[PDB]
Design a protein around this ligand. Structure first.
Ligand code: GSH
Ligand code: GSH
Ligand code: GSH
Ligand code: PLM
Ligand code: PLM
Ligand code: PLM
Ligand code: PLM
Ligand code: PLM
Ligand code: PLM
Ligand code: NI
Lengths: 146, 146, 146
C-alpha cells in the first residue's frame, strides 16, 4: 500500500469530479427551464451563461489535475491539496457568479487563476529541485580537467 | 517494476483514448459529408448531433479517468477496470445513438452515468477507508484524559 | 522518493499545462481585439479561428496526457517524453497556424497526430509486453494434460 502519501491529492481530485458533475446537472436543469433541447447550445442569455460556465470549468479541469499531481508529488502534498481546495472553491463561485451575471463571474475567476498559478509555480519549483542539482553537478564536470 | 498492480487501469485508459480518437475521426468524415469546413461548428442536424456527441464524451473523459484511477488505487483495481469498460462501452453506444437520433442517445447516456457514478462511489468508499480510521482514532484521543 | 523515474513525464506534462494556458490567454486578447464579450463564442473569422484552435487543443490535451503517462510507464520514459515534446511543439504551430489561416493549421495538425499516434503505439506495445507473456503461459497450460 503506497497510498498514504497521495490520498489528499486523490481526495481533492474526487471533490473536483463531484464539482464538475454538479455543474453538468445544472446545465441539465437550465436546459429544461429554457426549453433548449439537444443539440443546440444557444438560447436566452441565462442559459448561455450557465452552458459557458460549465464548459469553461471543464476545460481548465485537466490543467488543474495535472498541476495538482505534479505539485503534490514534486513539491509538497498538503500545500498542493490546499491550493486545490481554493481553486475548486473559487471555481464553484465562478460558476454561481457566471449564472446570475457575466460580470459576477470575474471575481471568482481571478481567485481560481491565482490558486492555479500557485500550483504551477509549486510544480515548477518542484521539478527544478529534482533536475537542477543533477545537471549543475555535471556542468561543473566540464571544467575538469584540470 | 511497480507496473503489475496498475496495468488494467492503464489498459482501460488506453481503450478510452482509442475510443475518443474514434469519435474525433467520425467528426472529420461528417465534416466532409456535409461540407462543414473549419471553423464553424454548425450545419444540418445530422452533423450537429455528431459534433455534440464527440464534445460530450470528451468532456466526461477526464472525469472518467480521474475516478477510474482513484477507484482502482483506493478500492479495487479489477472492479474499477470493469465499470471502466461498461462506461466506455456505454459511451460508444451513446455516440452511435446520438448520431442517428438525439433521443436514441438517452439510453446509453443513462448506462454511462450509472457506471460513472459507480466509480465515484467506489472511489469515495476507498478514500473513506484510508482516512476514517486515522481520524476516529484521534477523535477518541480527545476523550482521554481520563 | 520514487520521483526519479517519472520526472521527465511530469515536466513535459507541465510544459503542456503552460502551453494550454498560453492558448487561453491568446483567446482573452482576441476576445478584446474584436469586442467579443462573454458569453458568445462567435465573431469575425480571425476570432473564431483562435477560439477553435484553443478548444481543439484542449480537447486532445487529456488524450495526450493519458498516453504520455501509459507510454512512459509501460514502454520507455525518455521516448515518451520525446514524442511528448514533438506533440506539444506541433500543437504550438497548429495554434499559430490556425490563427492566421484555417488552411495553415493543417501542416502542424498532421505533425501533432503522428506524434500522438506514436505515443499510442508505444503504450499499446508496452501493455502487450506486460500482459501477453502471462496469458500465453496459461494458454499453454490448457494443453497439459498430457
Ligand atoms: N455539456 C453538456 C453538459 C450536461 C450533459 O451532460 N447533458 C447531457 C444530457 S441532456 C447531454 O447528452 N447533452 C447533449 C450535448 O452535450 O449536446 C450539455 O451541454 O448538455
Ligand atoms: N473537435 C474536432 C474533432 C475532430 C478534429 O480533430 N478536427 C480537426 C481536423 S478537421 C480540426 O482541426 N478541427 C478544427 C476545429 O476544432 O475547429 C472538430 O470539431 O473538428
Ligand atoms: N475557453 C475560454 C478560453 C479563455 C478564458 O479562460 N476566458 C475567461 C475570461 S474572459 C472566461 O471566463 N471566458 C468565458 C467563457 O468561457 O465563456 C474562452 O472562450 O474565453
Ligand atoms: C535529462 C535532462 C532533462 C531536463 C528537463 C528540465 C526540466 C525543468 C522543469 C521546469
Ligand atoms: C542531492 C544531489 C547532490 C549533488 C550535488 C550537485 C551540486 C550542484 C548544485 C548546487
Ligand atoms: C488529514 C485529514 C484530511 C481529511 C480528508 C477527508 C477525505 C474524505 C473522502 C470522501
Ligand atoms: C489500520 C488502522 C488502525 C487504527 C484503529 C482506529 C480505530 C477507530 C475506527 C473504527
Ligand atoms: C487479466 C487479463 C486482462 C487482459 C487485458 C489485455 C490488454 C491488452 C493491451 C493492448
Ligand atoms: C517474464 C514472464 C515469464 C513467463 C513466460 C511465458 C511464455 C509464453 C510467451 C512467449
Ligand atoms: Ni514504491
Amino acid at each position: 500500500h503506497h497510498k498514504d502519501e497521495v490520498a489528499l491529492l486523490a481526495t481533492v481530485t474526487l471533490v473536483g469530479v463531484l464539482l464538475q458533475a454538479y455543474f453538468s446537472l445544472q446545465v441539465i436543469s437550465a436546459r429544461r427551464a429554457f426549453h433548449v433541447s439537444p443539440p443546440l447550445t444557444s438560447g436566452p442569455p441565462e442559459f448561455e451563461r450557465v452552458f459557458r460556465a460549465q464548459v469553461n470549468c471543464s476545460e481548465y479541469f485537466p490543467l488543474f489535475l495535472a498541476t495538482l499531481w505534479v505539485a503534490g508529488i514534486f513539491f509538497h502534498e498538503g500545500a498542493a491539496a490546499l491550493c486545490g481546495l481554493f481553486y475548486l472553491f473559487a471555481r464553484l463561485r465562478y460558476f454561481q457568479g457566471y449564472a446570475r451575471s457575466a460580470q459576477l463571474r470575474l471575481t471568482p475567476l481571478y481567485a481560481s487563476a491565482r490558486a492555479l498559478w500557485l500550483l504551477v509555480a509549486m510544480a515548477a519549483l518542484g521539478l527544478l529541485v529534482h533536475f537542477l542539482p543533477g545537471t549543475l553537478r555535471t556542468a561543473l564536470f566540464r571544467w575538469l580537467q584540470m
